[PDB]
Each structure stands twice: as C-alpha cells, then as structure tokens.
Design a protein around this ligand. Structure first.
Ligand SMILES: Nc1ncnc2c1ncn2[C@@H]1O[C@H](COP(=O)(O)OP(=O)(O)O)[C@@H](O)[C@H]1O
Ligand SMILES: Nc1ncnc2c1ncn2[C@@H]1O[C@H](COP(=O)(O)OP(=O)(O)O)[C@@H](O)[C@H]1O
Ligand SMILES: Nc1ncnc2c1ncn2[C@@H]1O[C@H](COP(=O)(O)OP(=O)(O)O)[C@@H](O)[C@H]1O
Ligand SMILES: [Mg+2]
Ligand SMILES: [Mg+2]
Ligand SMILES: [Mg+2]
Ligand SMILES: [Mg+2]
Lengths: 106, 77, 72, 156, 104, 525, 75, 151
C-alpha cells in the first residue's frame, strides 16, 4: 500500500510515524471493543475455550473432527495445573487408524 | 519394495503400510479405493468444484458407508 | 480379474441387491455358480472394511488439500 | 459365457490411454481461450517471432505439440477452420472431452468399437437435434448478418 | 436430448451415449468458467431451463446469469456447430481405431 | 572349426558371422517379430498403427496397410528385410493380401522353428512344404468360381469384393457408400487397367461420408486472365506445345545485326510467329485449349481476345487424363486440323471445393478417367482413406482382368488346410509332419482373424475344420456375431489371384529363409 | 501431458512478468522527463557514444528480449 | 495408464517396471534359456560343461551336475533366479534330480507361454496344472514298489 508513495519520493520517516500512530490506535481499539465476560463461570469458560479451539482448528486437515479435537485440547489444558507447560502434554504418533481413533489419556 | 520418487506415490506406500499395521489385511484394497476416489475427484475438479468441497463430500459419504457397514454386519462365535 | 465383463456383472449384481433385500450378493470370482457370498462363505472382518474406507478417505482428503510443490 | 478371451497384450490399452491423455491435455490448454470472456495466448517460436492470438487453429498450429494425438487434433482444428472458419476452439474442446469420457468407458470394460458405433449414433441424433433447433435465414436481412458478425467478434 | 436418447437405448450403447452427452456438457461449463460464474450452478440452471422448454436459454455474461440470448443477439450459423460436431466425432472415431505406435 | 571360433581371425574389424543355430535363431526371431507386428491389423476387426517418423520431417502416419507399415520401419534383421520385400512385391502385384502374406510367412517360419527343434532336417521340411503348397494350390484352383459371363452376377461379385476389401480399413464406417463409389470408378475404366486414369483428390474438411465420385472430371489448374470462366458445348484441344518464349530449336542460331531498328524488327517477327501459331491453333475451331506446358502472357491475351479458355501447366498425367475423359488427341503440330480429334464435353466451369477453386468438366464424351474427391477431418484420415481406396481399386481391377473368385473369411484357408491334411495323412516320413505344420499355419491365419475380434478363436476354428472335413466347402467365419456361416450367402468373396499370390509368395519366402544356415555381415559403413 | 518442447507460463505469473517488463522499460526513461530531466549516455560496446534525451532513440538503441518491452519500444 | 508409460515420472533414476507382455516375455525367455542350458546334460548320454570363472583365480570346473552348473553362473533374469534356487533346494533335499526338475520346469513354462498365446487366462492354466499334478502324484505313488523287507 505504501509502495506508490515511496515511488513518489515521500520521506520514509513520515511513513514510519504514520504506521506507528495507526498501530497504536488499532491496538487500543482492539483492547477497547474486545468482548470479555466477568463471571468466571466454569461452563461459560469451557464453552469459550472450546469455541476458540474450534476456530483455531477450522483451517487444517483435521477440521472435520474439529469439535472432537477441540474438546480434547480443552480437557488437556484445563487439567494442566498452573504453568501450562507444553512438556506436560505428551504427543504420541502411531501409524494406522482413523483420526477418530485418536485418544487423550487421563 | 517399490522404488518411487514421486511424493504422492510415497503417500500411497505409507497408506498401505498403515493398513498393514492397523489391520494386516486389505492393504491392496485401500490403494485401489484411493485411486478411484482421486480419479473421480479429477472430473469433479474439471467442473469447477473446490477441492475442499470434494473432501467434505467424501467425508460425509464415508461416514454414511461406515454406518451402513455397521448396520449390515454379522457376528460370529 | 476373473475374466468376466466388469460393468455388466456389477450392474446385474447391484440390480439383484436392490430387488431382493440381500447385501451379501457379490462377484462370483471363482465361478461357483452363485452370487451369494454367505453360502460361498466369503467372510471379511468389519474392522478391516471400516479401516479401509477411513484410511482411504483421510489420505484422499490430504492429497486433495495440497496445491503447491517445491521440490529442488 | 464364462472367462472369455484373455486380454494377453494390454499394450493397446496403454497406447489408447496415452492418446486420450494427450488430447485432454491439449483441450485443457486451449480451454481458457473460449467465449466472450476468454483471453489471448502468447506464443514465441524458435525464432524471435511473437504471436498474440485467440484463434484456436492459430494457437494449435503455432506451438509444436510432438504427440500424435495432439497433432491429429491440430489437423482437426485446421479442417474446421477450412470448412467453417470459427469454432476451431470448440471442436478441439469437444474432441478432448469425448476422449476423456472414452477413458472411463474403456475402463468399464467396453471394446473401443462399440464406443465408436455408439458415438456415430449419438452424432446422427445430435445432427437431427441441431437441425430441429435451427431457424431459417435469408441474406436480405442485414440485422441477422450484423448479429452473427458481432457474435463472432465478441471473443477477440 | 442425447441423455434422453440414451435412456431410450440399452446395453453398453446407453452408457456410451450418456458419456457422449456428458462430454457435450463441457462447453457450457467452460463458458460459465472464464466468466466468474459458478460452473455447476450455471450448468444445472441451463439444463433445468432447457428441460422446461426454453430452447434458447444460454449463458448471459452481460447480466452475469442465464437468460434468453436471442434478445442478447448472440447467434451463430448452423454450419458451425454441425461441422464441429461432425469433425470431432470423425476424429474421435479415427483415434479409437488405433492400438500401437511404431517409430520410423 | 568355424571362422569366428578359430585361433586365427579371418575377418575385417566389425565383420562377423553366425553359424547354424545362431543364424536360424536370428532369422526366426526377426520373422516372428515382423509377423507379430503386422498382425492384429488383420481382418474386419483389426486396428491401425501410428508411424511416428523420427526424422527431420517427423511425419505422422496412421495406417492399416501392412505394406506401408513394413516399408516405413528401420529394419536391420536380414530375414525381416526378406519379409518386407515380400510384402512390397505383394503390394506391387496385387493391391491386397500384404498382411495376409506376411502373417502366413511368419507362421510358416514359426512351425519350421518347432520342427527344427524336433530334430528334422530343413530340407525335409522344404520338400514337405513344396508338396503341401502344390496340394493347396490345386485345392484353391478347384475352389474358384467364375461369374464374368453374367453381367449382374459379376457386378454383385464386384460389390462383394470391394466391400470385403474395405471391411478392414477405416472406410468400414461407410463401407456401402465407399464400395459403390469404388465399383463405379473401376467400371468407368472400360476394362483398361491403368489406375493412373483414376485421380484421388484429398481436400481437408467435411465428413468422410462427403466424399464422392464426380460424374465428370476435375482439374486443379487455373485459367488465363481475360478468358471465359464457363463454356457450354466445349470443343477441347489438348496440346503439348511450348508456347513459352518459343525458340527455334537450332541451338547455334543467334541474332547479329548492326542497328537496334533491326533488333526491333526481329522481335516483331518473333511475336508475329507466335501470333501465327495461335492463329493456327484457333483454326481448329475450339473453345477450350489445354496445354501441358506453360503459357506466357502474349499467347494468353491472344486466347483471351478470341474467347478461348487456356488451361496451362497440366502435367503429363493431366493431359493423359483429359484425353481419356474427353476423347481428345494430345497434339503438338497444327498444320493439319482435319487430322486432330477434339475432345468434347457438355460444360466447363469453376467449382468451389473447400477453400479452393477447381475446373470442372461435366457431361464428358468418353469418361474413361475418374476423379474422386476425398473429404476428411484430418490429414491422416485423408491419407488412410486414399490408401484404402487404392487397395479397393487395385483389387477390383484385378478382378476385372481375371473374374475367378474365391470365398474369404478363412474359408479358403480351411479348404487349403483340409487338402494339405488329406495329403499328409497318406504320406510316410517326417514330410507328413512338415505338411501338418503347413496346415497348422494355414489354419492359424483365420485363428488370428478371430482373435482380433475377441472371439473364441479356438472353438470357431475347430468348428470350421469340422465343417470342411464334413463337406461344407463354403463354411467361413461370420464376423457379425461370432459364429460360422455360409460365405456364398453372406457375400464375402475375394479375388482368386490375390489368394493364390498370397499362398505362393508366403511359401516362397518361407522356403528361401529356411534354406539359410549362416549369416555373414560385412563391416558396416 | 502437453509434451510441447518449450516453457509455459500461465495466470498471475505471466501477467506479473509482463507488468515487470513494462515497468522496467518505463523506469529506463522515466528520468528524462520535463525541464529538470537529465540526458543519458549510451555506450555501444565498440566505444560508440550516444548522448540523448529522446525516448525513441534510447529505446531503439537498447536491445530488448522481452516481447512486452518490445511492444512499448515500438509504441 | 501405466506406472511407467505415464506423463508424470514415478520412479527413481534407474528404477524400471515391466508390464504384462514384457514381464511374461522376460520370465519365459529366462526360464527357457535356463532349461536349454542345463539340458543336453541329461540321461546316460548327457555331456559335461566347462565353467570358467572370470575372477582372479579363474577357477576351472568341468561338471555334469545341474545344480553346480546353475549355481556358478551370472544370472540376472529373476525367473532364472527362481529356477536356480529351485534346483539348489532340490539338491539339498535329495542328491539327484537337479537337472530333471529344471528341465521339467522350463518345459512347463514353455507350454504356459504357448497357452497364453492361445488366449488362456493364467489362472485357468494354474488350476489345470494343480489338478494334473495331483493326478500324476497319485499315479506315481500307486506305481511305487517297496523291497525294504527282503534283504
Ligand atoms: N456475447 C456472448 N455471450 C455468450 N456467449 C458467447 C458470446 N459471444 C460468443 N459466445 C460463445 O463463445 C463460444 C466460443 O467462441 P470463440 O471464443 O469465438 O471461439 P470459437 O468461435 O473458435 O469457438 C461460441 O460458441 C459462442 O457461443
Ligand atoms: N466381412 C468379412 N468377413 C470375414 N472375413 C473378412 C471380411 N472382410 C475381410 N475379411 C478377411 O480379412 C483378411 C485380411 O484382409 P485385409 O486386412 O483387409 O487385407 P490384407 O489381406 O492385406 O490383410 C482377408 O483374408 C479376409 O478373408
Ligand atoms: N541307464 C539308464 N537308462 C535309461 N535312463 C536312465 C539311465 N540312467 C539314468 N537315466 C535317466 O536319466 C534321467 C536324468 O538323470 P541324470 O541325467 O543322472 O541327472 P539328474 O537326475 O540330476 O537329472 C533320470 O530321470 C533317469 O531316469
Ligand atoms: Mg486379503
Ligand atoms: Mg468464433
Ligand atoms: Mg485387404
Ligand atoms: Mg541324475
């Protein structure tokens, strides 16, 4: 978008300042209009996590089982204790079997 | 034992190995079925259908077929 | 593979399967004289067929999702 | 009748499939140059000569194709250009699609002679249908002539 | 019409004529393509309109849809479609009668 | 000891030799390869080949003709060269039977290989084959039926023969139309065998069924600038004169004067001589003038002023065909108008075929010369149609020369094989085995014909053999469904000359190849 | 599939390539426009020197092998 | 389409596959060549061969044994490898019969080639051969004579 203005000889410092101002405004707007629920409801929190996981999953080859894998991921993260260490979630890959054959071990 | 260089051929080989590991039989039927599915998807693509739509339809039909197999199955002692 | 005409045999078997409720009618590969696989005792595990269909569908989806190749 | 005659060779099938694939590739090549919304191709030969064209016969003749089925399709486009002068892209697309269907027909286990006679029957029926759909025209009507010329030029 | 004719036929001839009709369906699909229209929906709508009796229904690119095209003044002489069909059929029949390639 | 396996070497570098077993192996391998290649293009249900040239031209050719297939292949096996030349000579002698003769020779050599493996001296095989060839020859000769006396039956025989010849080729799609066309074209020759009098013009575009035999004649030449494009009741004069800067043939002559006025006078004299020649030509009272050579501008305008068509540069074939079709005489002197016959035709005009313009002669006087317009969708289709039509015309002309006919569809081969078997059953020694192998090859021919159609060849051939043993001498393969039937009723007939030539040439080539026990190759160049 | 003895480019690739070629030709002579434009000095690999501001001359002296750029040069 | 006769190349450099005609032809040629080589050393009037090793030692070995002839040769045709291994196993199981088994297998494969040329499905050939083998084995067993009792 700024390439045409660069071709006209506009000073890059002006473009940098404009980007900084626009980004600050956009981040403030995102923080302002983001929807948050101040209830700390377990059911609502679980549903929010499941929906966020499904949205993060509905672009990959496992998107057909996105509800299944979102439920698994939410369960795993919730049962993680306090630091949410990634090394505390084992990922074992075994050849053969359908995607629905995948399981989460308690 | 087939010396292939194409990556999709390697995917076919891995599919056969997966069928062998999980079941042990039917390692030839999977390859023929996959080839038939891709052959049909070719003529579907030629008519301007997004490949993701083809994959979704295949998944739906596979669910239907698996349910039908469970329905018409028989038990042995 | 058995030398029979594929389309004619498959069409006739499918028509017989529709006409009479008998999902056991298949291809008489050994030319035993009957199309009923139950008397011919041609038995396959349900797990095997389900795995076949599942794996084939998943691999086909994975191949359909690829739209770029960057070999050296 | 039982087992029937065993197909010893299977090389004729390979040759036939290869011919069909070549024709289908040619059609898919000249597939985007069809209709009022088609776009021109650009061909640079072994010399420095450069051609920008939408004419199917010109596109096919300009690029060397090296495959016997593709060369026969080029000759087909030339013949259509001689007899008609337009539809050179459409005839090649039709031939490619016909052979693409022949692939599945042969794979079903149909001899490539039942296919030919059935295609002849279909062609005769289609000629009857097209003749039924046609409308008489006399050269005294300038509007029809202008509409035909404009339709011909719509894709260039 | 050729699909109907195949329905009137029997045996492998019916399958071959069905394949012929499906192959003929390519040109409307290609016309729907290259124009931004959805090929599947456009072809299905054309087939439905023609089954309803609209012999002149065709792909309309000015309005981005399907409508009568005689009012769009899109006409061509008969000895274009007839010639193309005849020549394509002859070429396909010639190619089908080939089973070997010899290098001279 | 042998030349190659000797402690001292007697050969130039690159020159080798092959002793008995090795030479026989190479010869049999080459012959079997040739036979396997040419077959599968045999019979009504045969397929065509693609001859993709690897040369600079990279010419593409699609054909069912065995002779053309064998011609355009790079052959290095000498026995394969023998078979190729046999096929070429077969084509030169008669128009058909090339694939049949090649396949028969290959099958004979395969049987010879089996017999040699069975420890039989090749001379014994050759003697047995000579006896079997004789027996089959009298069998076929006694089988022949002649219909030349009856005009309607002879015409029906010609129709059947042309249909049978065209059954294998690409013209089988419109067999009826093309058979009628070929029969009419041959019958217009009035018994003359010159196939050069029949011109096949290939014009791209249009369906193969659009091909037609013109009722008059067609010429691919042009007309002068100021000359009529259409005349009625033409009086054609066909000539071979120069009329192009016509020089007096005294090569040592030259013009040597002392003034340019004299040069101008000599030039006017030359033009006056040309004008006098044109006047002498016109004294014949003609409308259309056809010259073999070029016609320059001055005679062109002289003809135009007189309202005379002047077709130029019609080659020797052109003037010969025009003389045949119109009855004119090819003249080169015009001092005796009364002694030169002028061709006549009802109408001359220009027709529009494809995108080209041709001169059309209508209502010709004699008509003993034909032009056939071939329309097709590809160049390969046109070339193959021309080859098939040439085969049909050759066979029809041969049948006109000799009207004896034999039944096709393998009936003749079954009859020959039955006669050979009958001879072999009353002959002692291994020559009986050789004759049985001869019969086996003769039966293998229609076996290949049946295999090409996907039929039960073994069962059909067994049925045919049983029928011929019983006494049914006209039994043959019914290719419509896959049974055996009466060839006389079903109208499958062939020329006796073609079958006799096929049998004799195949036997000859098999005999000459079998006689070889050593192949010596010189150093290649 | 095609078996054409040559290279093929289709879609956004060829369009962007043509745009790049045209843009390169424009950028060659964009600096010689208007009263504050400056001339160029062309050396013809045998020592011949051509100093010019005319666009046509600059585009004729340059040897170009991309056909869209050739189109602009002939323009 | 075929794995090798397809526009896309699915093999590494040097990989090769041979379809129906080529596979059957190579198998039949290899088997028949092996049978022809080992025969003529059969029966009381059989002759002996010379085996010249091409190695450094260039070991010389004249022999009539079929198994030793087939063992010390450079075989690259896979069907010929099958026949060589069959002869070796026959030698291991019993001392004699190494040449006879190879010749019999070669003749069987030659007849199979003829039958395939006659348009007979190889499964039919195999079924007929299995029945024939059962019948022949039964006849041979019925014809056996035992003398182990009398010294
Ligand atoms: N204005 C238009 N609206 C819809 N279709 C059109 C229009 N103009 C042309 N066509 C169609 O486009 C098709 C392709 O024609 P064209 O692109 O000129 O190549 P060709 O004439 O060689 O087929 C024709 O069959 C015609 O029916
Ligand atoms: N309609 C038919 N019915 C049965 N046999 C036929 C028929 N037409 C041709 N044949 C057989 O096909 C054989 C080969 O003919 P063809 O391939 O046309 O020329 P060539 O003799 O050069 O091979 C002939 O011997 C003939 O007997
Ligand atoms: N004196 C003999 N008379 C007839 N046949 C014999 C005689 N000796 C051996 N044979 C036959 O020769 C065949 C081949 O045996 P041989 O050549 O010794 O080697 P191998 O047993 O390894 O094939 C045997 O089947 C046997 O029947
Ligand atoms: Mg199994
Ligand atoms: Mg047009
Ligand atoms: Mg013939
Ligand atoms: Mg022994």
């Amino acid at each position: 978008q700024v390439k045409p203005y660069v071709e006209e000889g506009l000073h890059p410092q002006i473009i940098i300042r404009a980007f900084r101002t626009a980004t600050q405004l956009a981040v403030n707007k995102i923080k302002e209009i983001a929807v948050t629920v101040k209830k700390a409801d377990k059911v609502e929190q679980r549903k929010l996590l499941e929906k966020c996981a499904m949205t993060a999953l509905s672009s990959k080859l496992i998107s057909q089982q996105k509800a299944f894998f979102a439920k698994m991921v939410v369960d795993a993260v919730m049962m993680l204790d306090d630091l949410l260490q990634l090394k505390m979630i084992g990922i074992k890959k075994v050849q053969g079997g359908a995607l629905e054959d995948s399981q989460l071990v308690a | 034992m087939m010396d292939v260089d194409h990556q999709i051929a390697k995917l076919m080989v891995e599919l056969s190995k997966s069928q062998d590991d999980e079941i042990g039989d039917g390692t030839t039927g999977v390859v023929v079925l996959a080839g038939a599915l891709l052959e049909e998807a070719e003529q579907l693509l030629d008519r301007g259908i997004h490949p993701i739509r083809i994959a979704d339809g295949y998944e739906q039909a596979a669910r239907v077929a698996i349910e039908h197999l469970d329905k018409i199955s028989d038990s042995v002692l | 593979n058995s030398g029979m005409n594929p389309i004619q045999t498959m069409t006739e078997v499918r028509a017989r399967q529709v006409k009479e409720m008998n999902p056991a009618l298949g291809i008489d590969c050994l030319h035993k004289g009957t199309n009923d696989m139950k008397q011919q005792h041609v038995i396959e595990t349900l797990i095997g067929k389900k795995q076949q269909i599942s794996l084939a569908t998943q691999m086909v989806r994975m191949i359909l999702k690829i739209d770029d190749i960057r070999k050296p | 009748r039982g087992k029937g005659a065993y197909q010893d060779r299977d090389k004729p099938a390979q040759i036939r499939f290869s011919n069909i694939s070549a024709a289908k590739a040619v059609a898919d090549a000249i597939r985007t140059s069809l209709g009022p919304k088609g776009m021109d191709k650009m061909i640079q030969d072994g010399k420095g000569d450069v051609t920008i064209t939408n004419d199917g016969a010109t596109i096919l003749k300009q690029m060397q194709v090296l495959h016997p089925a593709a060369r026969m399709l080029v000759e087909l486009s030339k013949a259509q250009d001689i007899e008609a002068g337009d539809g050179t892209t459409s005839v090649v697309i039709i031939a490619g699609s016909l052979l693409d269907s022949c692939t599945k027909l042969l794979q079903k286990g149909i001899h490539p002679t039942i296919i030919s006679e059935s295609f002849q029957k279909a062609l005769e029926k289609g000629i009857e249908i097209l003749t039924d759909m046609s409308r008489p025209v006399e050269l005294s009507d300038r509007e029809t002539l202008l509409n035909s010329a404009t339709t011909s030029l719509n894709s260039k | 019409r050729l699909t109907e004719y195949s329905r009137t036929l029997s045996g492998m001839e019916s399958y071959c004529v069905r394949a012929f009709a499906d192959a003929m369906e390519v040109i409307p699909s290609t016309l729907a393509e290259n124009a931004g229209l959805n090929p599947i929906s456009t072809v299905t709508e054309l087939r439905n309109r023609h089954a309803q009796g609209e012999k002149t229904a065709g792909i309309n690119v000015r309005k981005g849809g399907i409508s009568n095209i005689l009012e769009e003044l899109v006409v061509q002489p008969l000895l274009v479609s007839v010639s193309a069909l005849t020549l394509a059929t002859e070429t396909v029949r010639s190619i089908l009668k080939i089973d070997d390639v010899v290098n001279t | 000891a042998s030349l190659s396996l000797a402690p001292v070497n007697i050969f130039k570098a690159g020159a080798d030799e092959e002793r008995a077993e090795t030479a026989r192996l190479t010869s049999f391998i080459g012959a079997i390869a040739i036979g396997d290649l040419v077959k599968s293009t045999l019979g009504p249900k045969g397929m065509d080949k693609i001859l993709l040239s690897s040369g600079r031209d990279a010419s593409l050719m699609v054909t069912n003709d065995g002779a053309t297939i064998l011609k355009n292949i790079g052959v290095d096996n000498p026995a394969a060269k023998v078979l190729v030349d046999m096929s070429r000579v077969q084509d030169d002698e008669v128009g058909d039977g090339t694939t049949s003769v090649t396949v028969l020779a290959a099958e004979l050599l395969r049987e010879a290989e089996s017999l040699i493996a069975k420890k039989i001296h090749p001379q014994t095989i050759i003697a047995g084959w000579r006896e079997a060839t004789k027996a089959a020859r009298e069998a076929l000769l006694s089988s022949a039926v002649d219909h030349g006396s009856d005009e309607v039956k002879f015409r029906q025989d010609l129709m059947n023969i042309a249909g049978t010849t065209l059954s294998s080729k690409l013209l089988t799609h419109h067999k009826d139309h093309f058979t009628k066309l070929a029969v009419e074209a041959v019958l217009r020759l009035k018994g003359s065998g010159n196939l050069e009098a029949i011109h096949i013009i290939k014009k791209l575009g249009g369906s193969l069924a659009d091909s037609y035999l013109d009722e008059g004649f067609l010429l691919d030449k042009k007309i002068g600038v100021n000359q009529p494009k259409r005349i009625e009741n033409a009086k054609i004069l066909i000539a071979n004169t120069g009329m192009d800067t016509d020089k007096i043939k005294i090569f040592g002559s030259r013009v040597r004067v002392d003034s340019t006025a004299k040069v101008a006078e000599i030039e006017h004299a030359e033009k006056e001589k040309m004008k006098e020649k044109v006047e002498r030509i016109l004294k014949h009272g003609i409308n259309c003038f056809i010259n073999r050579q070029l016609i320059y501008n001055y005679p062109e305008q002289l003809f135009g002023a007189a309202g005379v068509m002047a077709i130029e540069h019609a080659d020797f074939a052109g003037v010969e065909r025009l003389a045949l079709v119109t009855g004119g005489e090819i003249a080169s002197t015009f001092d005796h108008p009364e002694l030169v016959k002028l061709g006549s035709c009802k109408l001359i005009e220009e027709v529009m075929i494809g995108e080209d313009k041709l001169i059309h002669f209508s209502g010709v006087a004699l008509g003993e010369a034909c032009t056939i317009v071939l329309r097709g969708a590809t160049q390969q289709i046109l070339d193959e149609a021309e080859r098939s039509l040439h085969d049909a015309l050759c066979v029809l002309a041969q049948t006109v020369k000799d009207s004896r006919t034999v039944y096709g569809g393998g009936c003749s081969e079954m009859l020959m094989a039955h006669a050979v078997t009958q001879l072999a059953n009353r002959t002692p020694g291994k020559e009986a085995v050789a004759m049985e192998s001869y019969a086996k090859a003769l039966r293998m021919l229609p076996t290949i014909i049946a295999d090409n159609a996907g039929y039960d060849s073994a069962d059909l051939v067994a049925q045919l053999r049983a029928a011929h043993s019983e006494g049914n001498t006209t039994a043959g393969l019914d290719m419509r469904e896959g049974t055996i039937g009466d060839m006389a009723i079903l109208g499958i007939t062939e020329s006796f000359q073609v079958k006799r030539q096929v049998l004799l040439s195949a036997a000859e080539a098999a005999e000459v190849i079998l006689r070889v026990d050593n192949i010596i190759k010189a150093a290649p160049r | 599939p095609l078996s054409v003895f040559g290279d093929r480019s289709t879609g956004e690739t060829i369009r962007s390539q043509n745009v790049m070629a045209a843009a390169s030709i424009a950028n060659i002579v964009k600096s010689s426009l208007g009263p504050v434009g400056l001339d160029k000095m062309l050396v013809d690999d045998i020592g011949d020197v051509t100093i010019t501001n005319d666009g046509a001359t600059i585009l004729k002296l340059l040897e170009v092998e991309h056909p869209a750029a050739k189109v602009l040069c002939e323009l």
